């Protein structure tokens, strides 16, 4: 079709989007569709002749929607939030229209330059040390990665390469294969699975560092592991410290870990995928104290900062430390900052979001969510039948019906079968725990109260 | 903002998109902006209070656009085409509205199931062997990757893992570090750089296979390299065969390479990033004869098949051969098929495109482009002052002004400085060559004739 048709159709799509989001509260959050349901509802072959937009759009309602899990219903309380905001959407539309591939500066200077500048804005909102800012003459800078799992993998590969170079440039005969055999990487036992994948791909060993009572990685445990391993002939080289674990949203001790990785000369990567967004708020910024020591810091604006998915923010103090694994001031070659060669004009989304919401708007959004999270915690704290399993700092609450894991597995089964709200569990020291996460952009105190009541009702029934 | 505002603003954005594309022919293809131009035209900090959509949109025209390289101007004849169609755009808008993250089947069954089905449609359009189709009981299947460079890397990692396992299943007690040291991978000397990055990340050795007169990889050269290396104690394990090299769009011999990789038991990956789209046309399908032998096949619909960037299609005959590196019929866990854990509902784009254009529409688009490419070749063939450097099969023509490399470097400099059209050169056996690639969706015979005339004029001037 041509421009004229797109004005028509494109505008129809906008109303569709608005309708879907406007009425999302009337959607059943989790689907009843069975695995493999879709293939039989669709032809076996692409059509030879065109189909009608109208026809395709109703297929969306009648066939696709039944297999959709609505992350944006205020009743979606699973995992962590995924971002979705009108400003990013508008931006995404533009990005697609300009349709450039920023694999090189010449392919579109702006695709590259807006990114560096936006990463600096965000860097400043987080109050990161100047060492991470590109500016006009800093050895550091930031880049948009596809996801936190990729950011982590990129850091590990940069670390791996850096340690192999140092070792070979000090031991002539030395082969890389030799160095890999003894390379060890560490992460909290609460670390995300993206770390294992990273070690797996990078071809190195990964060890877990037992966490403390507050589920945090401490200097003590880390040091022990290091000594134990150096003494065994191994070579520590990478450590991922997590800020806002996926289990209970706890925080590794950065002021204790940073100094250790520094003195031991270990690449320290900080994965704050979820909690990172909160650091633009003074109240929480302390949680990030210690970045000073990090070689690379990452968090997902596509989780809790309203920038629609496909937007993870990563910073490093020495651009060449990163650039070297795939080979000041202005950056022109992002292709040495990530795994793939191509990339979209993703920074448009950050720009539209940061500009259309403003810093204050963003801070409010986060606080409202943390407020809602504490309201839920209160409910649980008020009912003697339940218990709150971990300190509640941000938008996640881990609760439990006082009793056995069997009793709790049961409550969960009854909650999901009821199809009103959607929750996910996790194990916290082997114990079965239920997670309550504030997600949707449009969640209100009302949704939480109703959600709690519904859970309390089911627990009661189950208890009789 | 809320749904109401988005209907307004969102519709404005649609007209903006339509205007930009509608008037793109009046845009200067390549920018005059200097590196680093943007930072000083934007504030140093994100705004505290909201900004106006109206204000943001004019900033787009006045500040972003001057730094944009217009890939969709019919006068953009660089690299290879990047896709952009209204159907994919409409689809992308929807994808963002639904906004789910398909990291697991439960996160949204449809995000996963539509993908498998679409990959089968495309698989059939290409007339791939049934072995690659998921169907209801095939060990194979296809997945959308972020790009051809990632597809290649994924294949190599799958290969690496598979050969390390076999070698230990043979000599129980064999270390991985040991096996990597001797692992060798091959690619044509015309292969894309994504292959080197892959070998670099995977930590193995990569060797180039000298190409023939038609710049193709032949059985002879490959076999020679293999023997030479096995005999030296090395272990061949991965071979990338390219269909549509970026230099002159030549084709490795798949009927010669497949059998070799089979008997030698080497993982054979086929990178047809650009040329692959043409295979939905019977006339060209022979170029793909030999996939039968491939372990993995890949091409970019986001290049020459109108599915907006962020859409590379990859197929394998044994899903577990792929799944194993990151650990029939219906597929539920795409997370073991790619590097990252998260993913967008990208298949919506393929669906909208395939349905709104229909197979015949797609075939016409490709043929029209190949027709235009041959029209250009004709022009060059008609002028005794120039020469065509390689067989012209698809949308690319490599030409040259008869003379020295210096003379040609000069023509190129004069073409880019003129700012009418945009071309890129490359070296073909050390010789400086100019590339002419049909890209934009809206290119016509008229654009090509004017482009040729303009180049002939500049060549003439220069020749005096
Ligand atoms: C959500 C999460 C991830 C995964 O992020 P993606 O961008 O989906 O890869 C990684 N680490 C932590 C701590 C997370 O909370
Ligand atoms: C364009 C191209 C690639 C790279 O594709 P992306 O998806 O941009 O990474 C790889 N191989 C060939 C032959 C190509 O033409």
Swiss-Prot record, chains A, B:
Pathway, per Swiss-Prot/TrEMBL? Answer: Catecholamine biosynthesis; dopamine biosynthesis; dopamine from L-tyrosine: step 2/2
Q: Which Gene Ontology MF annotations are present?
A: 5-hydroxy-L-tryptophan decarboxylase activity; aromatic-L-amino-acid decarboxylase activity; L-dopa decarboxylase activity; pyridoxal phosphate binding
Residues modified to N6-(pyridoxal phosphate)lysine:
303
What this protein needs as a cofactor is: pyridoxal 5'-phosphate
Positions contributing to substrate binding: 82, 192
Q: Name one GO cellular component term.
A: cytoplasm
Name the protein family.
Answer: Belongs to the group II decarboxylase family.
The record's listing under Gene3D superfamilies reads: Aspartate Aminotransferase, domain 1, dopa decarboxylase, N-terminal domain, Type I PLP-dependent aspartate aminotransferase-like (Major domain)
Question: Which EC class, in a word?
Answer: lyase
Q: What is its EC number?
A: 4.1.1.28
Instruction: Specify where the region named 2 X approximate tandem repeats lies, as residue ranges.
Output: 58-178
| The protein, known as | Aromatic-L-amino-acid decarboxylase
Catalysed reactions, semicolon-separated: L-dopa + H(+) = dopamine + CO2; 5-hydroxy-L-tryptophan + H(+) = serotonin + CO2
Species of origin reads Sus scrofa
Q: How does it assemble?
A: Homodimer.
Q: Which keywords does the record carry?
A: Acetylation, Catecholamine biosynthesis, Decarboxylase, Lyase, Pyridoxal phosphate, Repeat
Q: Which residues bind pyridoxal 5'-phosphate?
A: 148-149, 246, 300
